[PDB]
Design a protein around this ligand. Structure first.
Ligand code: CA
Ligand code: CA
Ligand code: CA
Ligand code: CA
Ligand code: CA
Ligand code: CA
Length: 395
């Protein structure tokens, strides 16, 4: 009948009328990259490759969520607030005195199964709720709603409200952009993910650099996010998806992704990309989880993590999907504290970075170096520590 494909083209020569001439149609036209999502009969693909302006024709691969209920729970109550062990392990609580992430210019975008926007322990921090499932950007609450629970859990590890109920996130006051890129089963196509990354940049107003001053992330005049957290992965490495990542990276946005739960030699994608921070998972005894894919950039609590769950509930999950938000919450604190002090945010460094002039540089040097001294295939640079990370940033 038809298959979904992503085409990297030359804007000056690619003619959309061409695809419609071969029984295909346009699904989504990227704004930040020279590519377009289209549906064409499985038999017309060979025609696309030869059309003027068509440089590359890539298939629509899949990624999946990396978090599962620890005991098959479906969510339970938490009348009185409690601090999940992973939140203290990342030394977050002592930082709230400096900032809790409630600095207006900061927003963290979580590309996941969506979110339970009415959850009493999350609602106040949900600044934007959107979905990009099936190549279409929807701003309707019914479409952005979490239908799995994963997204609600990941978001709660980052920004669950510090009050009298349930739990509390690493940055309990930071603004959240929930971008649904995974279905009810936790499955997501790369196209919807790339489109999700774009929306995190474009923001609610749909414009990347509204005032055209070259500043996107960290610019109060714009509504772009300064952090993109992806608790998902896949074995495919597509050119267009990577192009979108470079786009978010160049915008000054720190990208964080789960390492993967196959115990593989290296991280899955997009974690595997150098501009993205690959996150491994440790347990309550500081041991690296055996399922945690090797060679990560850093590691964080990822075993038996309690957080928010759909229907104003709470649940314990496990996976590298649970460690990722811990790290994203740490960068949120760093950028928030840095901007509160100086009127700007820190640059997004690289993997090899080891200075206090970069977000990643700071994460690496202040991480709790476990296992063999220095970076290792298990813990990476070590376990992220918000308290030390913020001191080095403001230091
Ligand atoms: Ca709470
Ligand atoms: Ca914008
Ligand atoms: Ca701007
Ligand atoms: Ca500006
Ligand atoms: Ca922002
Ligand atoms: Ca080490």
């Amino acid at each position: 009948n038809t298959i979904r494909v992503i085409v990297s083209v030359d804007k000056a020569k690619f003619n959309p009328h061409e695809v419609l001439g071969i029984g295909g149609h346009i699904v989504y036209q990227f704004k930040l990259i020279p590519a377009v999502v289209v549906d064409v009969p499985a038999n017309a693909v060979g025609k696309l490759k030869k059309m003027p302006g068509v440089e590359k024709v890539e298939f629509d691969h899949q990624a999946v969520l990396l978090g599962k209920p620890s005991w098959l729970g479906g969510g339970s109550t938490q009348p009185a607030q409690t601090i999940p062990w992973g939140i203290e392990r990342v030394k977050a609580p002592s930082v709230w005195s400096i900032t809790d992430g409630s600095v207006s210019v900061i927003q963290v975008a979580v590309l996941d199964t969506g979110v339970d926007y009415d959850h009493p322990d999350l609602a106040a921090n949900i600044a934007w709720c959107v979905s990009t499932l099936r190549g279409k950007v929807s701003t309707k609450l019914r479409d952005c709603a979490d239908q799995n629970g994963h997204g609600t859990h990941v978001i709660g590890t980052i920004a669950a409200l510090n009050n009298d109920i349930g739990v509390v996130g690493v940055a309990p006051g930071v603004q959240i952009y929930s971008v649904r890129v995974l279905d009810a089963r936790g499955s997501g196509s790369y196209s919807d993910i790339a489109i999700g990354i774009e929306q995190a940049i474009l923001g609610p107003d749909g414009v990347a650099d509204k005032d055209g001053d070259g500043i996107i992330a960290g610019d109060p005049d714009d509504d772009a996010a300064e952090v993109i957290s992806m608790s998902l992965g896949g074995p495919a490495d597509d050119s267009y998806l990577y192009d979108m990542i470079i786009q978010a990276y160049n915008a000054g946005i720190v990208i964080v992704a789960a390492s993967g739960n196959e115990g593989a030699p290296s991280p899955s994608y997009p974690a595997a990309y150098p501009e993205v921070i690959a996150v491994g998972a440790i347990d309550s005894n500081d041991n690296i989880a055996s399922f945690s894919n090797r060679q990560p950039e850093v590691s964080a609590p990822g075993v038996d993590i309690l957080s928010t769950y759909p229907d104003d509930s709470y649940e314990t999950l496990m996976g590298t999907a649970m460690a990722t938000p811990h790290v994203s919450g740490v960068v949120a604190l760093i950028q928030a504290a840095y901007y509160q002090k100086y009127g700007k945010i820190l640059p997004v460094g690289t993997f090899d970075d080891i200075s206090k002039n970069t977000v990643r540089g700071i994460l690496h040097i202040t991480a709790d170096d476990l296992g063999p001294t220095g970076w290792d295939a298990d813990y990476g640079y070590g376990v992220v520590r918000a308290a030390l990370a913020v001191q080095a940033a403001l230091g």
